């Protein structure tokens, strides 16, 4: 492939460099339209800018935490982090978010990796070996109430059991209801006067719930869960302007008030170098 062809002096009536940008086109002008060039080859394919590659590496999408401790006398397991859940979503952590929102609709399979590490902040004789049981709880399924409810039987709901310190990995097909996931949605769930506006209405994909299977030892053990997400088989439509201001909320476009100028001011003139 040639990156530049050889081109010499020109004295024409045919001027490729004068255009009318009002038309909305970006005319494909090249170095050889306005200087004299020599042949050179590309030596490159643009492999690593493919959208599959761009969205295809694992990104941290969520960090939560649960603890193993005596539940005796706990009136609210959920509240003691005896188990915890996560209202699945991919917009909470914002590094991966800016990348996805370069597109309007996106379609992909997900590969999740879940790393779990334990901490024992206060005096323990040892490190126990805990098994985590993260289970997927889709919309309209008995949400779990204690850390050892019938829910955890999970007879119809996919669940994975792995050890703290290890990693769990599995992959979920594209579960969207439509043909693509909306990265943006300028609508409502119905024409009410006070119903929420955004995608949050849209992208209610149910939540994920984690717990330790082990009963309690004499000390307490903090287990912190990190969920990583990798898109595989990516398809993206309609590019948009990149995010400039900071994010404030999952699912709304809102930016913070009295934010700071995002364009760097010159130290000098327009004329400055």
């Amino acid at each position: 492939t040639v990156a530049s062809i050889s081109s010499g002096p020109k004295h024409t009536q045919k001027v490729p460099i004068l255009t009318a940008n009002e038309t909305g086109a970006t005319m494909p002008v090249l170095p050889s339209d306005s200087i004299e060039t020599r042949t050179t080859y590309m030596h490159f394919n643009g492999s690593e800018t493919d959208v599959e590659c761009f969205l295809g590496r694992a990104a941290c999408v969520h960090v939560t935490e649960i603890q193993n401790k005596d539940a005796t006398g706990i009136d609210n397991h959920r509240e003691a982090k005896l188990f915890n859940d996560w209202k699945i979503n991919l917009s909470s952590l914002v590094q991966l978010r800016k990348k996805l929102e370069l597109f309007t609709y996106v379609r992909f399979d997900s590969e999740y990796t879940i790393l779990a590490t334990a901490s024992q902040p206060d005096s323990a004789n040892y490190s126990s070996n805990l098994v985590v049981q993260a289970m997927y709880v889709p919309p309209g399924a008995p949400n779990p109430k204690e850390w050892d409810d019938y829910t955890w039987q999970s007879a119809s709901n996919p669940s994975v059991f792995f050890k703290v310190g290890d990693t769990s990995r599995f992959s979920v097909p594209y579960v969207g209801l439509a043909s693509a996931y909306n990265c943006f949605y300028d609508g409502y769930s119905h024409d009410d006067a006070e119903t929420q506006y955004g995608i949050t209405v849209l992208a209610h994909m149910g939540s994920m719930a984690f717990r330790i299977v082990n009963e309690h030892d004499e000390h307490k053990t903090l287990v912190k869960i990190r969920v990583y997400h990798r898109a595989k088989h990516v398809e993206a439509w309609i590019p948009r302007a990149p995010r400039a201001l900071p994010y404030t909320s999952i699912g709304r476009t809102n930016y913070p008030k009295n934010t700071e100028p995002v364009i760097k001011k010159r130290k000098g003139d327009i004329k400055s170098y």
Binding site: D191, A244, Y247
Partner: protein
């Protein structure tokens, strides 16, 4: 003697002529078309009013003055009240449509000024409150009036800050969306053909707007000496290939 410059668009029972055009943009290089069976889901036969809905509606005019910040209309909202297009809209459960948008602004060879005319698929607005305040329905359904970016923040309304496109992105990059400029010195109209863009084959026309049309002054209007300091901008829009499905009782929407 054909120029890129003169054009005629006849759609239904209405025709537009421009003698000072700058080509026309067809979003994503695709022209509006009906919904193919292979893509269909709802089993209902759809209704295609054709020429009674696919004609040109001219919205009320705006006034560009030296202080203007820009205006924003949503589709199909802007047309919610135009003739039979609008009736069909409130009466069917689902509908689908593409449009021809023609924005008009003429001046003289002594004026200067340049407007950006852009179509943004799925333009989800931001609340000026920050945090996770929502933007109430009425605020994102201004109707033919559209939203005036130089109007004041209101409560439950969107933010109207132009350098941020009403969503946290910079004005400068709106050029990645199908758009055309109106530069008084060149141009006097802008025309964009919009194919139907959605993640579902057909949708509700009232709970979801699928494009915002935005006209934004970028190089300020400058009139000749002792000229009146303003020009009107007119927007005429025509639904094209419209289909409605799931007819019934007639939606009632807030406000």
């Amino acid at each position: 003697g054909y120029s890129d410059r003169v054009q005629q668009i006849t759609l239904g029972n209405s025709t537009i002529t421009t003698q000072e055009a700058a080509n026309a943009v067809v979003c994503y290089a695709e022209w509006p078309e009906y919904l193919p069976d292979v893509d269909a889901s709802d089993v209902n036969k759809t209704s295609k009013p054709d020429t009674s809905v696919c004609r040109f509606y001219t919205l009320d005019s705006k006034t560009w003055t030296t202080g203007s910040k820009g205006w924003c209309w949503k589709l199909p909202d802007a047309l919610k009240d135009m003739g039979v297009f609008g009736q069909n809209m409130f009466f069917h459960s689902l509908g689908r449509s593409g449009y021809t948008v023609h924005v008009q602004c003429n001046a003289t060879k002594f004026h200067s000024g340049c407007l950006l005319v852009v179509v943004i698929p799925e333009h989800q607005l931001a609340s000026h409150e920050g945090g996770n305040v929502s933007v109430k329905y009425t605020f994102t359904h201004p109707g033919e009036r559209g939203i005036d970016l130089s109007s004041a923040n209101e409560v439950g309304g969107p933010v109207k800050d132009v350098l941020y496109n009403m969503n946290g992105t910079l004005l400068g990059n709106l050029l990645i969306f199908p758009h055309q400029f109106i530069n008084l010195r060149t141009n006097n109209t802008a025309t964009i053909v919009i194919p139907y863009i959605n993640s579902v084959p057909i949708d509700s026309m009232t709970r979801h707007n699928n494009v915002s049309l935005m006209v934004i002054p970028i190089a300020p209007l400058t009139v000749p000496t002792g000229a009146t300091p303003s020009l009107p901008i007119t927007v005429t829009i025509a639904p094209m290939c419209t289909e409605f499905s799931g007819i019934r009782s007639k939606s009632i929407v807030p406000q």
